Each structure stands twice: as structure tokens, then as C-alpha cells.
Amino acid sequence: MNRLQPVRLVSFVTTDLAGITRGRSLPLATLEEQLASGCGWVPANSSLTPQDLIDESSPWGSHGDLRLLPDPNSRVRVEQGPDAAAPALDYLHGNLVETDGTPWPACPRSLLRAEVERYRDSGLQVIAAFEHEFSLLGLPGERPAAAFSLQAQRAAGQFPGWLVSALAQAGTEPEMFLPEYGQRQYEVTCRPAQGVAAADRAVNVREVTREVARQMGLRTCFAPLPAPGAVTNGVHLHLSLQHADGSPLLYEPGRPNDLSELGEHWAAGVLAHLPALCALTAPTAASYLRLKPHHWSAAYACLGLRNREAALRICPVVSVGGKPLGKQYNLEFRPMDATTCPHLAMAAVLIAGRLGIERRLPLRRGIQALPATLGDALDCLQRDEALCAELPKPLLDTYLAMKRHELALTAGLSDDDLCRHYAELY
Amino acid sequence: MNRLQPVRLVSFVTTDLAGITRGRSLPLATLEEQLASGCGWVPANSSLTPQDLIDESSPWGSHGDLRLLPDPNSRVRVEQGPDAAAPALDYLHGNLVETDGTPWPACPRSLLRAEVERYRDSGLQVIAAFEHEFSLLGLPGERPAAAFSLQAQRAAGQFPGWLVSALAQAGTEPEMFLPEYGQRQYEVTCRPAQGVAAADRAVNVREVTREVARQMGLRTCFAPLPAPGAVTNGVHLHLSLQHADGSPLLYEPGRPNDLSELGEHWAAGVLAHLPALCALTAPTAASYLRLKPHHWSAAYACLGLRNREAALRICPVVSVGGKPLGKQYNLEFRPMDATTCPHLAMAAVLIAGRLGIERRLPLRRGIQALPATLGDALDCLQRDEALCAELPKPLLDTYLAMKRHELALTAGLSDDDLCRHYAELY
Amino acid sequence: MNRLQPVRLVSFVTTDLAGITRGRSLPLATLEEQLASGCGWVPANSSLTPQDLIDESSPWGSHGDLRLLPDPNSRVRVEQGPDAAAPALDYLHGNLVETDGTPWPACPRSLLRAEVERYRDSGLQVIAAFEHEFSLLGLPGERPAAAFSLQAQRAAGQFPGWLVSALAQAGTEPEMFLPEYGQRQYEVTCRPAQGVAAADRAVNVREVTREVARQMGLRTCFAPLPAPGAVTNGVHLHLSLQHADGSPLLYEPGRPNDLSELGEHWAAGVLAHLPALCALTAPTAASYLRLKPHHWSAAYACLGLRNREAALRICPVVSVGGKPLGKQYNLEFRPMDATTCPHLAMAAVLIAGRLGIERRLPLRRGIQALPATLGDALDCLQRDEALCAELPKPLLDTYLAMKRHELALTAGLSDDDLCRHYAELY
Amino acid sequence: MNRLQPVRLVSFVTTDLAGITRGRSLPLATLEEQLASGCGWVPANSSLTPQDLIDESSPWGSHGDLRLLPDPNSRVRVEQGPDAAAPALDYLHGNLVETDGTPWPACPRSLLRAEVERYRDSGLQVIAAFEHEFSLLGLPGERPAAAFSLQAQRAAGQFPGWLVSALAQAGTEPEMFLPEYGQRQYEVTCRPAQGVAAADRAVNVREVTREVARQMGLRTCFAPLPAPGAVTNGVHLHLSLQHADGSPLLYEPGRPNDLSELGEHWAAGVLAHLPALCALTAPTAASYLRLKPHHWSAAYACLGLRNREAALRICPVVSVGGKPLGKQYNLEFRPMDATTCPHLAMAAVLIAGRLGIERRLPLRRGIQALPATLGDALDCLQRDEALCAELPKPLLDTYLAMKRHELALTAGLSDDDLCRHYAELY
Ligand SMILES: N[C@@H](CCC(=O)O)C(=O)O
Ligand SMILES: N[C@@H](CCC(=O)O)C(=O)O
Ligand SMILES: N[C@@H](CCC(=O)O)C(=O)O
Ligand SMILES: N[C@@H](CCC(=O)O)C(=O)O
Ligand SMILES: [Ca+2]
Ligand SMILES: [Ca+2]
Ligand SMILES: [Ca+2]
Ligand SMILES: [Ca+2]
Ligand SMILES: [Mg+2]
Ligand SMILES: [Mg+2]
Ligand SMILES: [Mg+2]
Ligand SMILES: [Mg+2]
């Protein structure tokens, strides 16, 4: 009489400290009833390593279970993708809380929201955009064409058109799609967002790219190193800081670089803490094949107007034809990859920046090397009590333990095996 | 309710010194906002060799990044090709400029536009057409049929019909399609265009042929030598010179050949500089398997009414039935292949011609051999200070360095490997 | 909005001395403009051997290039074939001329048209039909069925129905289709045509049979010997001669055979020159596996009412039921195959016939063996100054050189290899 | 605008002495013009053996060629078969004649028509039906099911339904379809026909069964022995003889068997000549694997009311429920297979019967063994001057020579090879 429909499922998700987005789903009809209670969640999930193992070193064994509470404003709805028979993608980001309503200290979305608050309190809005690079696997046709080339964009067939449309439907404001330097490498960028929404966007961009690829029988890889001796997949975070008003507070013509005193304090905090921030913005064992790629590199916490050997780069304005200038002025953090948790990573950066501003840190030998393995990066984080102290203590323990465990699971493992290993997790 | 559409992406492209067309794309809805700023671009991309490597010998490391500024008049729109599910091909050629509006010296489109200007200033319009030969791979059916044969055109199935239509839609004015001498070789020719548009056409003809082949599951090859011991793929440039008026200034009946004094000066400049022009019109290592094909050849800078052993050939008029005569009179430069950058190549030729005219060079032993390897061809370019001096100096450095590097990357490599190597890049 | 169409291409063709039809194509919209100028063509193409090689022994290197001038009356239009997605077949036969309008002496269509003229001048119309045999490869189903059998016609599926229809659309007047003696052998015959149109038909019948087979994923072979120890593929030319009026001038009841005095002169010229005509009507190296098939054969220039061991056969009238008689009276030349150029072959025959009539040659030991290899056949042609003299001298040189070269390319080569070799060219 | 149609071809056929049906076809539009002249045919085709070879022992080399003159009353039209895309089957049986109208003595249809005449002259109509058995190869599904079984009829899928319909459309009057004793064996029977039409039916039944199988991707085999150690494929001819009126003249109740004096004379002639008739009703080398199947058999010319070890069997009437009786009374000849020429075979039988009647031969040791090889069967035919004398002499020579030649081609060849050999020809 009528050909029946599959039920539309809605997911509640969280993106854990392992940079994985996880959740549970319910029939659409139930969404309203479900919104206030969210869905159950188990605290020990926050001790899962990329390899899906929990240690006994977790603080969370036994301990009473949590609620994953969807925030109604973060809803993503992609009604149609490449495959006309495929279910909508429908889900909401949530915060983790104890059963009474009590904000759970090891929740990475919550931490970022508290830090944005601390930002608001002293009059700063946070405006950010994550740029994402990935490998597109499975495409038909010839060997990959030249880097950056029209042919490489063409080889992708209907994928870029469907990707941008899926990201538009998902409310990401897609804006640029391009083939990048490596073989099968592409990049999609979106319009900036304020606060938490900016990290939600980073998650949405990843989860939707994955879903479009799935719908076409393709695969993506966001691992920092897609395969041995490949061009690496970065994530770059552009941050501007604005008076509760739209007035750009990072930027001041005629002061050199066009950087504010405020600006310089902010950048200085990020710089002084970078070797720690690496544990949180290049947080996996595979991250260090990207950060220290060739024999000795070392890689430093310095600044650039000029070059992209700099960990933090000033993105100067474009005058050219109309504009306007300064709204587009921002600072780009570069030692970041997609194995991160967008919320934890952005939170970590805005923190050290805050600490820069709070102690009116001056902008400078006054320059550290970034660590060279995850181990070294966790050493650094442990040594930076100023930064650690801004992190809710249970997060730090569960993070610090979970990562030791991640590196336990990976040790002895060749550089190559490790890269192949992670190219299967991101 | 409605089956959604993939977003239409518009690309901004540049064709680099490596003869590769590269760019970035945006959603159609944004095109208007995007036109004034263009899109970002990195100067160091102009040091990429055909093998996609940059040396430390580049002038562009560190240095501040550029804008790729689409010229609205060069837009290509192919709405439909062989595959009804395929995205339109939509893109615009752009010039590279520094962030304030400042014409970037290493931009090959810009250089050609400045040279056309220098042409206009002294009263000459430049009218040109590039003829393109290519291999069509993947066709079903028997062994390839006879050279030039109806059967060989038929074997191509729906490809020639879809090719001409795609080129028509792209505003190239396709005019001739034919099977050529080698197995799977075809040639498409188009109507001449004035100035920059003539080089844009050369790029458009290549990029669209590639896209039609892609849409049918076929492949093209434009490399100078498609495979070992194959008939070679040439590019021939027909140039006529006209008073700002349509009055042909190359041609004068009864003066022998029907060549003008002007004409002879022009041809003489091209001839005297040919061994240098080779570095810019046969600019890849694989180019010399085509220019000096058999054991000793050597190949010379001479002229022909008569034969195609001549590097520069007068294409006499066709009277026959109606006509008219002289508008169709032109000169064809022959040591050119598709590994070039249409704009750089045409610019280089019109330059030496200009120098011919400026020094009223007479038309003649007064005859040089064309070089025999890329190395020799770059030696020659370095030795021809008259020509070098017309090139913006940063272009020359970045070109000269990038090509050494290209030949570094290829050395020791057998003639055959080199040909197979390049048959994968063009 | 509208699903676009592939452009319809029109070809201009010539059938060269190698019996290959070659040309170039243009968009339909341009046909009118293009008709007066035709398209470019290179004289040296007339020195290509079946194996697609030109020697230095060609008269045409250097020499200025030609026009291929479509004759509007020879247009072939097949709008639809077996594959509904396939392009029309659209092309016109052309004559080759120098750039001013000047009939090029090495053009085989032109030579035949001049000979028909010489025929008209003395009051004779030439009426001819070529019968064609070929192999049809790729058919599904069992081993081939019995020679001449209903099952063999049935095995061909939709091919004969589509073949006749394609030939009807092409204006060939198809009339008979039949399975022949060899495995996968078929024959199609058409209604006779006058003069040049008769040779155009021979070309059209070949090119369309090929196109129908292509459209069905089948292949044809017209080589004199399709594969080792196979039944051979002949071409038979039926010629009648008529007063500028329809009055048959070959035929006279009661004179024996019903042959005219005129008739006997004509046949006598053909007979006296046959060993030369073989170089032009069995003109390839593979032709002699057909003409002298078994150990000693030798094969002679004699006549038959009676049998098909005769090189020239009188095809007597059919009374039976109605008729009428004499209009259908003709003479069939038999040592002919599809590796010929229909125009060159028919021209050559009508010539020797003319010479028969001009010298009132009587009809007779007065009997020669036909040569046994191409070499011997070219010896014979060189020795027959009477015939050579009617050929435009440049044709003869370019032909005579091109064929030496063909036999150079083939020598040492086994009988079998040679047959397999040619089964790939026709 | 309109999707064009393939041309409908009409064939003119003859069934040669080798039991193969051969012909040539023309476009439907031409059928009317073509009917009076028929189509050309070559006398030497009547010397082709089953293996498609002609000897020098043929009487027909040189000799002037013939007309195949379609008899308009024998037309077969099957407009639709299993494959909706397949051409109609359209053809007419013809008689062979010399070019003036003169009945050709070696034509098997003509001979049978002359014998039916000789029958009419003395007041007898000839009423006959051929029963045909065949193998159906290629069927999907399990091993073949039990002999005679519903499952075996079912395994044939849509074939029996399409076979009967095709035979109905062809005007054969199909009446029975059944699985038979051997694996993949089927039998179709039709209503009797008078005279020549009865043999045309036998040909039509074979050619259409073949065409239906072709349309479904199946194959048939009618060879006397389909494969080594298989149940054999017979052909049985039922003959009744009637006053020019419908009055059955074979049958007389109360005279024993219900056989007429006339009847007994007729049967007696068939019996006395059977060892010769075998050369014409079991006429191939493979026929003797069927006639003498096991070690010694020998097989005799005797009669049966009773059993099917008899070469000639009385088919008694069925009373049962209504009837009527005697119209259905007939005699069945059994040593016959599908390698015959229906017309030659039926002609041969009616002859010896005639000779029985003419010499009022009595019905009886008075009993011969049937030969055991083709050789012996041809010996017998040569020895029976009474029978030979009724055959047009040129038929006999061409037959007798063609078959020696057939057995030359097959000698040394194992029983099995021979069976496999012929299973490919019928
Ligand atoms: N793929 C580089 C970024 C290159 C670029 O986009 O400039 C990275 O790992 O960060
Ligand atoms: N394929 C030749 C051109 C031959 C021609 O079109 O005349 C080349 O490399 O330039
Ligand atoms: N296939 C034969 C012709 C046979 C025929 O049609 O009589 C030949 O080479 O000419
Ligand atoms: N297949 C048997 C006939 C069996 C029957 O139908 O009785 C034959 O060769 O005649
Ligand atoms: Ca490539
Ligand atoms: Ca995975
Ligand atoms: Ca071929
Ligand atoms: Ca067969
Ligand atoms: Mg990037
Ligand atoms: Mg060319
Ligand atoms: Mg024939
Ligand atoms: Mg039976």
C-alpha cells in the first residue's frame, strides 16, 4: 500500500580526549523526551586510548556512570548525501555531567566552554576556524595528478560538490575546497565561529567528510602522516580576539606586524607554553612523525609574519580590492593535527594565551624546541604547573594516564608501522 | 521531497612555469564576493618542478604569500560533458599579485600581458592559435587503425563529438578534429584569439580534453613523447601580426614569400634567439626526445615556405574558392610541445620577434643548431642576455633554478624511463 | 534543463594508393564555409605504405602541401546504426588539388574522373559495381555453420539487417547479402553506379560495413586472405559500357557470347594488360596468397562464359521470367581484392580496355600468366609502357616507390605472418 | 526523431543433397521484383560434402551457373521468437533451374515434385509427416532428468512454448512436443501435409527449431548420434496414400493388418529396395552408428504391426472415443535421420513404393539386411538399377561422387570422432 521508511535515528555525541566522537542514538520521535535526560555514558570511556584499551591506571573503574546531555544549539542535520538511499546524518553535541546535573570535570566540551566564559568575563569573544587536510582514498582513474592541480580536483569526481553541500547542510559554512600538496590530499576550510561552536565545527567538518566518503565507497584519512614518506595532514587553527562588539583587539596598524599590546601578550603565552601545548595539540604517538619529520628538525616555538616554519603565524590583512582590514586579522597556530579533540585542543591554546595576557608576558635566546615524541610532550605538560593548574585536575590525570598507555601500546614499533597503525584510526 | 544537488564549485587557476594549471575552488554562491580578493597562493609553488619537488635553491622560501586574482573575462564554463552526472567544469584564469595589488614578477600570464601591451604601444595586435596533439588511451576495440584514417576517428566513439562540444561550450571555438600520424594520436585545432586570450585558449584546450577523457573513463597524454618509439606530440603556434585595425602587417604580395619587411624583421628575431627560446618552448627533459629524435639530427633555426624540417614556417594563403587572402597568412613556430606554459611560451616567442623588429635584424652561414638536451637549452638561455633582459628577473631565477632541479631529478635516467616518466605528467 | 548533444562531425576523405580512406573532420555548422576550401592535406601521405611508413624514396618530402576538396555530390550520411548512442557517420569524398585549384596528378579519384571523361568524349558511359567479400569476427554462438547456409546468415544476428539498412541510408543501394564459402565469410552486393560514383560506392560499402561491425562490438576483415588456409576474400568488378543513352554497347545477340566487336576490343585490352593490372588490382604483398593460392597455380589472363578459373568473365543475361536482357549484360574482372584503392583499380581497368578499343586489338598461344608476387607484378607494370603512359607520371613514381617499400617492409616474412600481418590492415 | 529499423531480409533457400539448407537474401522491398528471376546459384554447390569440400570428381566444375527460383507458396514467416530484438525469419523454398527456365536435373525439390506428379497421374495424393528428434544443449539447471518426464519438459524453460509458437507462425501446424528417451532429447511432431509441402515442413521444422534455440542462447543437435553412447536421434516418415479425394487407399478393414492390396504392393517395393534407400534416407557416415548401433545388429527390411525393430511399421487406427478410422491409417518408415535432404529422402521412398505398385510386387527367406556403413549403402544403390533408373542421372552421379568423397574425408576416424564430428554438422 505504502513502502515503509527506515526510522531516522538521532545521535548524542561527545568527542573524547582521544579525539574520537562517540555516542548513542534514538528514534527521532523520542528526541523531545530525550533532550532533558540525554543518554547514559560510562566515565571509563574517557580512559580509552586510540587502540581502544583502558588500563587499570584509570581513575574511573567502579565509579558511578554519567549523563551525556545534548546541547540543542549544536545540532547537525545533513538530510541528503551522495547516496540517495542513505540515512540522514543527525546528531547533537553534548556535555558530560553526573546524574544530578553536575558538570563532569573530565568533559572536554565543558572545559572549553568554561574557558570561553573566563574569556567573556574579561571582555573577549573568541573567534576561530580550524583548517583540515585529509587523504581521499579509493578514487577511480589514473595515478594521482600534480599537487594543487585542476586535474586533481577533477579526479575527485562528485565528491567535492557533495562535500561542500553536505557541510553547507550541516551548518558548517563551507567556503574553500582544494587539492593540496600530497597525493590524494584535499583541504576544506570554513567560515570562523565564536567559542564552542568553533570546535563543534572542527568535529562536524571531520565527521561529515567521513560520511560523504562513506556514501561514495571512498575512504578518508586525517592521520598526521597518511602513509610512510607522504606529505603530512595538518590542522591549523586561526584565532582572532574581539571586544564583545566585533572590534578586533588583536590588531593595531602602525604598531609593527599590526599586533596589539594585548595581541603580543596573548601570542607570548602561547609561545612560552607551546612545548606543553604539544601534548594537547599534537597528542598522539603518530603526531611526532609530522612535527619532527626529517632527521634532526627539532622545530621551534617562534613567530612569523613571513614563513611557515613558524609555530605561530600572523595572517596579515588583504587590502587589494575593497576589504575590510582587521576583522580578517588573526593568528594561526600550526603544530596541530586531526588526532586531537577540537575542544581540548582549542581550550589548551586559549589557556596559555590567557596566561600570556594575565601576566603581561613580553614578546622576545628566549625560545624553546617543541618536543620530539609524545613522551617528551607529556614530560613537558607535567613540568608546566602554570598550565596544568588551569586544567580541571581529573582531566589531567585521566589524560596523562591514558596517553602513557597509548605510548605503552605503541613502543618498539617502527616509525612506519606506527604511521600505518594510526592511518587506520584517523 | 526534492533530491538535493552537489554544490557547483568555481576554480581560480594559474598555469605555472612547469606548464601545470593549479588552483582552488569555492561555492558558486560566493563567486561575486570572491572575485575582488581572489584566493590565497604561495610563491614557492612557482619553484615546483614537474616531479612536484621544490629545492632550497628557490628564491621564495620564507617570503610573504600572494593573491591569485581571477580575470573575469577568461571564465570557462562547460555545463555538460559525456557523463551526465559530472560536475560542470567552471574556472577562471587569474594573475598572481602581492597582497596590496602589486603585479608579481614571476607570474607568466602577467608577463605575457605586459608583452602584448608593449606590442600594442607600437601599434601591433597579436593574433595566435596553438595546435595540440595528444594520445587517447583506453579506447575499446581492435589494435589502432591506420594513421589519419576514418576508422581511427571512428574508434574514438563519442569522444570527438563530445570533445568539440565541450570545447565549444568552453568558448574555445573548436574548428578541426582529426586522427593524426601516431597510434591513438588525435589533433584538435581552434580559431585564433588575440593576445592573452590566445594562451588561455591553449590552456583551456588542454584542460577540457583531459576532462572529457576523464568523463568517459579514458586518458590523454600530451607529453612530447607518449611512449618509447612513438610518433611525438607537437604543439604549433600560428602567429599573425595586425595593425590595430585587422590590416595584416606580416604580409605583402610580390615581396617574396609574401613577407613584409616588418615580417622579415620579426621572423629574424625569432630565428636568432631560437636556441634560447627552446628552454621556454621545449622546456622539459622529455622535450629533447622530440626535438632531436634520431641519432644525430641536431635540428636547426631556419625558415620554410616549403617543408616541415623548418623551425619556423610560413603558412601561405589558400586562394582556391573565394578566400580572402592575407588575413589567413601567418607564421608557424614548431619546436614547441605541451609541457610548456602557454603564456610563458607565447611571451618568449613574441619577445624575440619584438627584438627582431626593434633592431631591424636582417633575414639570412647565419644559422644555429637548436640545443639537444634541456641542459644545453638552459645554457643557451643564460648566454642570450638580450632576451633574458626582457624577462622580469625573478621569473628567470625561479625558472632557471627550478629547471636545473628538474634535470637533477631526472639524470642517469634512460631515454625510455624519462619518456615513460613524463608520459605520466602531461 | 536540456541534456546537451555531442557535436556532429563531418569528415572530408580521400582513399589513398594504399587503399586506405583518410581525412579530417569539422563541426557540421561549419560545413558550408568549409566546402570551398576543403581541408589541408600533406602530399607525402600518398607515399604511406600499408605499414604506415614513408621512405626517403618519396618524391614529396619538402614539397608544398595540398587541399582536399570535398565533392558535394558524394556525401554519405548514415544517421543511425546498431548502437543508438553512436555518432552519425557523415563524410564526403574529395579530390586533392594544389593551393590555387590545380588538380594534383597523384590523386586517384581525379585520375579515375579524367578517364571517365576520356570515356565520355568518345561516347561511352561507364557502369560498374564492386562485389565485396569479408570476414565477420566476434560473433557469439557455436563454431561457424556450413558454407552458404541459413544458419550462417542467422548466426550474424542483427548485423545483416543493420548492415543493409546502414548501406541504404548511405545511398549505396544495397541489394544482396549472403553468407559465403569461408567460415564467417559474408558478401554484400549493390546496384551498379555510373563512373566515379561506382568507385565511391566501393569505398562506402567498405567504410560502412566496418562502422556497423564497430557499432556491435564486431570486427571485419577484407584482407585478400583472412587467416592462414582460409577461403580468400575477393572483390569483383562488373562493368557494362553504354551509349550516352542506356543503349548497351558491350552486347550483341547472335554474335557469339553476345559480345560486340566493341566488346571484344575492350576485353582484349584488359587481357593484354592484365599482368600489369595486377599491380593495381591485386596491389599488396598479401594479394599473392590469393591470386596464386596453391603450390603452382600460375593463374592466367583468359576469358570465360563458362567458368571462374577465368580472370575475365562474361555474365550472360537471365531470361527466365520477364527480364529485360542486355542491360544486365556485363563483364566481370576477378583478380581484384579489397586492399585496392577502388578509384585507382577501376581507372586502371578501364584504361587497358580503352587501349584495347583504340588499337582495335583482336581477341585470341596468345595468353600470359598473371604474376605471382607483388615484385613480379611491379616488374610487369614497369614493362608495359603503353599502360604506364596513360597514368599521370607522378602517380606512377609515388606508387611504384611506395610499393617497393611495402615489399621491403615485408620480405623474409613467412606466407602465414604476411597473411596475419595484412588481416590486421584490411 | 524516429529510432530506425534494421532491414528485413528475405532468404531464398534450397536444401542440398547433403541435407543442408542454403541460400541468399535480399531486402523485403525487393521481394516482388526478385520473385521471377530468383537469385543466382552455382551448380558445384551440389557437390559439397558435409565437411564443405568439393572434389575434382564433380561433374559441375566450369559448367554455367543456375537460378534458385523461390516457389511463392512455400514462404515461411516467423515474426517473433524468444528474443524480441531478433530479426523475423523470412524465407522461401526454391527450385534450381538453368538460366532460360529449364528444370535442373540435380535439384532435389524438383525430383520430389516430379515424383508426386507421377503419383497424381495414376490417381494418388501423397500425404506425409516427418517426426523429428533432437538434443537441446545449454539448458541451465541440474543433471538431465528422467526420460519422458514432466521434469525434463520443465527443464526446457520457455523453449517448448516458444518452439511451438514459432512452428505455428511458420505454418508447420505443430501438434506434439515431448521430452524423449535420451538426455536432453526432445521431439516435435506436426500435422501431415500433401506432397512437396510435406518435405518443406521437414525442412521448416529443422530450421525453426535451430532459430528458436539460437534466440535463447541454446543449441540443437539433430545428428543421428548426438554424442558417444547416447540415445540416437531418428526421423520417422508417416505416409498415407489417398484417392484424389481423401479416400484412404492404403487401408481395408478385414483384409489383415487392414492393409489394401494396393498397400501391400506399395510396402513391398519399399521393402525390396530398402538396402538402397538407406543410401538416401540414412545418407551420412554417422548414420551407421544409429542403424547398426551395437556389435552385430545387422538390422532388416521387414514389416511390423507390432514392434519397432521393424524398418516399416503399420500405424494402426485409434478407435477409443469417436475417431474416425483409416484417415489416420498410415505406414511409418524408420531408417531415416536428419542428415537427409527431406525432399530427396521422401522422393526416394515414394519411388520404391511406386515400383512396388507398378510391378504388383507380392509381400513375403525373402528378406535383406540393411547395409552397415555408408560404403555398403552406396554399393547397394549402385546395384539397384531398377531404382537408379528413376533418378535423373546427373543427380545420381553428383550424389554418388559427393558421398564417396564424404567417406574419403572421414575414413580411419574412430566411431566416436565420427559421431563428434557429425554432432557438429546437424
Ligand atoms: N600539510 C601541512 C600544511 C601545508 C600548508 O597547507 O601550508 C601541515 O602538516 O601542516
Ligand atoms: N607530431 C609532429 C607534427 C606533425 C604534423 O602535424 O605535421 C610534431 O611533433 O610536431
Ligand atoms: N572468394 C572468391 C570468390 C568466390 C565466389 O564468390 O565465387 C575470390 O577470392 O574471388
Ligand atoms: N530415437 C529412436 C526412436 C525412438 C522412438 O521414438 O520410438 C530412433 O532413432 O529412431
Ligand atoms: Ca598524471
Ligand atoms: Ca578506522
Ligand atoms: Ca586494423
Ligand atoms: Ca554446426
Ligand atoms: Mg593547507
Ligand atoms: Mg599535426
Ligand atoms: Mg562471391
Ligand atoms: Mg520418438
PDB file of N, CA and C in Angstrom, chain C residues 136-162:
ATOM      1  N   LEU C 136      33.475 -11.731 -40.848  1.00  0.00           N
ATOM      2  CA  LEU C 136      32.823 -11.137 -39.682  1.00  0.00           C
ATOM      3  C   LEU C 136      33.287 -11.860 -38.442  1.00  0.00           C
ATOM      4  N   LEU C 137      34.084 -11.161 -37.632  1.00  0.00           N
ATOM      5  CA  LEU C 137      34.669 -11.694 -36.402  1.00  0.00           C
ATOM      6  C   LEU C 137      33.999 -11.158 -35.173  1.00  0.00           C
ATOM      7  N   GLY C 138      33.812 -12.091 -34.241  1.00  0.00           N
ATOM      8  CA  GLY C 138      33.446 -11.803 -32.865  1.00  0.00           C
ATOM      9  C   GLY C 138      32.063 -12.325 -32.562  1.00  0.00           C
ATOM     10  N   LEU C 139      31.473 -13.079 -33.489  1.00  0.00           N
ATOM     11  CA  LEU C 139      30.057 -13.350 -33.340  1.00  0.00           C
ATOM     12  C   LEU C 139      29.921 -14.290 -32.171  1.00  0.00           C
ATOM     13  N   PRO C 140      28.825 -14.151 -31.420  1.00  0.00           N
ATOM     14  CA  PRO C 140      28.640 -15.151 -30.362  1.00  0.00           C
ATOM     15  C   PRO C 140      28.292 -16.509 -30.987  1.00  0.00           C
ATOM     16  N   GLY C 141      27.962 -17.476 -30.143  1.00  0.00           N
ATOM     17  CA  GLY C 141      27.434 -18.754 -30.605  1.00  0.00           C
ATOM     18  C   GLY C 141      28.463 -19.796 -30.921  1.00  0.00           C
ATOM     19  N   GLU C 142      27.956 -20.889 -31.489  1.00  0.00           N
ATOM     20  CA  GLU C 142      28.711 -22.104 -31.843  1.00  0.00           C
ATOM     21  C   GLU C 142      29.922 -21.873 -32.802  1.00  0.00           C
ATOM     22  N   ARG C 143      30.718 -22.928 -33.073  1.00  0.00           N
ATOM     23  CA  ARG C 143      31.524 -22.989 -34.299  1.00  0.00           C
ATOM     24  C   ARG C 143      30.683 -22.441 -35.509  1.00  0.00           C
ATOM     25  N   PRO C 144      31.346 -21.866 -36.566  1.00  0.00           N
ATOM     26  CA  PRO C 144      30.622 -21.364 -37.762  1.00  0.00           C
ATOM     27  C   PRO C 144      29.840 -22.474 -38.418  1.00  0.00           C
ATOM     28  N   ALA C 145      28.683 -22.166 -38.983  1.00  0.00           N
ATOM     29  CA  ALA C 145      27.947 -23.231 -39.648  1.00  0.00           C
ATOM     30  C   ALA C 145      28.408 -23.388 -41.110  1.00  0.00           C
ATOM     31  N   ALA C 146      27.766 -24.348 -41.774  1.00  0.00           N
ATOM     32  CA  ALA C 146      28.048 -24.658 -43.124  1.00  0.00           C
ATOM     33  C   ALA C 146      28.061 -23.424 -44.064  1.00  0.00           C
ATOM     34  N   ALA C 147      28.969 -23.479 -45.043  1.00  0.00           N
ATOM     35  CA  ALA C 147      29.045 -22.525 -46.113  1.00  0.00           C
ATOM     36  C   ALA C 147      27.664 -22.254 -46.757  1.00  0.00           C
ATOM     37  N   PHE C 148      27.354 -20.982 -46.987  1.00  0.00           N
ATOM     38  CA  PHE C 148      26.189 -20.569 -47.782  1.00  0.00           C
ATOM     39  C   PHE C 148      24.836 -20.781 -47.040  1.00  0.00           C
ATOM     40  N   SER C 149      24.874 -21.183 -45.761  1.00  0.00           N
ATOM     41  CA  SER C 149      23.745 -21.800 -45.096  1.00  0.00           C
ATOM     42  C   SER C 149      22.907 -20.801 -44.318  1.00  0.00           C
ATOM     43  N   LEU C 150      21.603 -21.105 -44.197  1.00  0.00           N
ATOM     44  CA  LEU C 150      20.643 -20.215 -43.487  1.00  0.00           C
ATOM     45  C   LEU C 150      21.184 -20.011 -42.077  1.00  0.00           C
ATOM     46  N   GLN C 151      21.731 -21.068 -41.493  1.00  0.00           N
ATOM     47  CA  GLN C 151      22.235 -20.929 -40.152  1.00  0.00           C
ATOM     48  C   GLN C 151      23.346 -19.941 -40.071  1.00  0.00           C
ATOM     49  N   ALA C 152      24.156 -19.853 -41.130  1.00  0.00           N
ATOM     50  CA  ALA C 152      25.307 -18.914 -41.074  1.00  0.00           C
ATOM     51  C   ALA C 152      24.802 -17.508 -41.195  1.00  0.00           C
ATOM     52  N   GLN C 153      23.756 -17.291 -41.997  1.00  0.00           N
ATOM     53  CA  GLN C 153      23.168 -15.963 -42.047  1.00  0.00           C
ATOM     54  C   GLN C 153      22.527 -15.627 -40.668  1.00  0.00           C
ATOM     55  N   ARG C 154      21.804 -16.584 -40.068  1.00  0.00           N
ATOM     56  CA  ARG C 154      21.233 -16.381 -38.747  1.00  0.00           C
ATOM     57  C   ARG C 154      22.225 -16.105 -37.663  1.00  0.00           C
ATOM     58  N   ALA C 155      23.433 -16.697 -37.750  1.00  0.00           N
ATOM     59  CA  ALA C 155      24.417 -16.550 -36.669  1.00  0.00           C
ATOM     60  C   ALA C 155      24.811 -15.105 -36.527  1.00  0.00           C
ATOM     61  N   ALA C 156      24.685 -14.379 -37.638  1.00  0.00           N
ATOM     62  CA  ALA C 156      25.106 -12.964 -37.717  1.00  0.00           C
ATOM     63  C   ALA C 156      24.146 -12.043 -36.943  1.00  0.00           C
ATOM     64  N   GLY C 157      23.077 -12.626 -36.387  1.00  0.00           N
ATOM     65  CA  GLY C 157      22.163 -11.894 -35.504  1.00  0.00           C
ATOM     66  C   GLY C 157      21.512 -10.709 -36.234  1.00  0.00           C
ATOM     67  N   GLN C 158      21.605  -9.526 -35.624  1.00  0.00           N
ATOM     68  CA  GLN C 158      21.056  -8.246 -36.194  1.00  0.00           C
ATOM     69  C   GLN C 158      21.985  -7.523 -37.222  1.00  0.00           C
ATOM     70  N   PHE C 159      23.162  -8.098 -37.458  1.00  0.00           N
ATOM     71  CA  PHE C 159      24.189  -7.454 -38.295  1.00  0.00           C
ATOM     72  C   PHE C 159      23.733  -7.339 -39.738  1.00  0.00           C
ATOM     73  N   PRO C 160      23.310  -8.441 -40.381  1.00  0.00           N
ATOM     74  CA  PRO C 160      22.892  -8.226 -41.794  1.00  0.00           C
ATOM     75  C   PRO C 160      21.753  -7.189 -41.942  1.00  0.00           C
ATOM     76  N   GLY C 161      20.696  -7.294 -41.107  1.00  0.00           N
ATOM     77  CA  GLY C 161      19.586  -6.293 -41.115  1.00  0.00           C
ATOM     78  C   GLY C 161      20.108  -4.875 -40.930  1.00  0.00           C
ATOM     79  N   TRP C 162      21.065  -4.690 -40.028  1.00  0.00           N
ATOM     80  CA  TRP C 162      21.626  -3.342 -39.774  1.00  0.00           C
ATOM     81  C   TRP C 162      22.622  -2.956 -40.800  1.00  0.00           C
TER      82      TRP C 162
END
